[PDB]
């Protein structure tokens, strides 16, 4: 019964993962990354949760992480220079799809009868065209890693219905 909703949500997540890779690939072709750009405003990458007791924490964390990515994607569209202007509408599509995914996750969380505010980031516009390019690498790369983790976690949830 709950497995159908979950399988839909795994599919959406895989598709969002592919969307995120494609976007990162396009950026990379335009401006290859010059290092591993830590954005302080981004969440720390979650440690890849075998048991049924660990999974609620994983969903809670996943949601918190994706909301942060959602704010950062918006920020990139708002504050991106002409250097990102050609990727902006794809980012817009990505943001719609992430919004959709998040709502699915929240539903899933209510169907499973789980429990569970104040946001500061990402905030200020990049110091230069290059700063924004650096942030885009970090945002899309972090989102990629988070979704790949998400896929695996939702698969383990499936085991425990």
Curated annotation (Swiss-Prot):
Residues 144-152 are annotated as: Important for interaction with IL11RA and for the stimulation of cell proliferation. GO terms for molecular function: cytokine activity; growth factor activity; interleukin-11 receptor binding. GO terms for biological process: B cell differentiation; cell population proliferation; fat cell differentiation; interleukin-11-mediated signaling pathway; megakaryocyte differentiation; negative regulation of hormone secretion; positive regulation of cell population proliferation; positive regulation of MAPK cascade. It is found in: Secreted. Changing residue 144 to V: Increases affinity for IL11RA and stimulation of cell proliferation. GO terms for cellular component: cytoplasm; extracellular region; extracellular space. Changing residue 148 to V: Increases affinity for IL11RA and stimulation of cell proliferation. The record marks 130 as: Important for interaction with IL6ST and for the stimulation of cell proliferation. Keywords: Cytokine, Growth factor, Pharmaceutical, Secreted, Signal. Its main location: secreted. Cytokine that stimulates the proliferation of hematopoietic stem cells and megakaryocyte progenitor cells and induces megakaryocyte maturation resulting in increased platelet production. Also promotes the proliferation of hepatocytes in response to liver damage. Binding to its receptor formed by IL6ST and IL11RA activates a signaling cascade that promotes cell proliferation. Signaling leads to the activation of intracellular protein kinases and the phosphorylation of STAT3. Interacts with IL11RA to associate with IL6ST, giving rise to a multimeric signaling complex. Belongs to the IL-6 superfamily. This is Interleukin-11. It comes from Homo sapiens (Human). The chain holds residues 34 to 199 of 199 of the full protein.
């Amino acid at each position: 019964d709950p497995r159908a909703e979950l399988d839909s949500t795994v599919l959406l997540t895989r598709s969002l993962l592919a969307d995120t890779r494609q976007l990162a690939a396009q950026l990379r072709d335009k401006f290859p990354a010059d290092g591993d750009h830590n954005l302080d405003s981004l969440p720390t990458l979650a440690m890849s949760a075998l048991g049924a007791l660990q999974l609620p924490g994983v969903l809670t964390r996943l949601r918190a992480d994706l909301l942060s990515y959602l704010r950062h994607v918006q920020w990139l569209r708002r504050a991106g220079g002409s250097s990102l202007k050609t990727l902006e509408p794809e980012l817009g599509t990505l943001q719609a799809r992430l919004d959709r995914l998040l709502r699915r996750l929240q539903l899933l969380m209510s169907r499973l009868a789980l429990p569970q505010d104040p946001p500061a980031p990402p905030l200020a516009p990049p110091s230069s065209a290059w700063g924004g390019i650096r942030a885009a690498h970090a945002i899309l790369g972090g989102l990629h890693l988070t979704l790949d983790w998400a896929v695996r976690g939702l698969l383990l949830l499936k085991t425990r219905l």
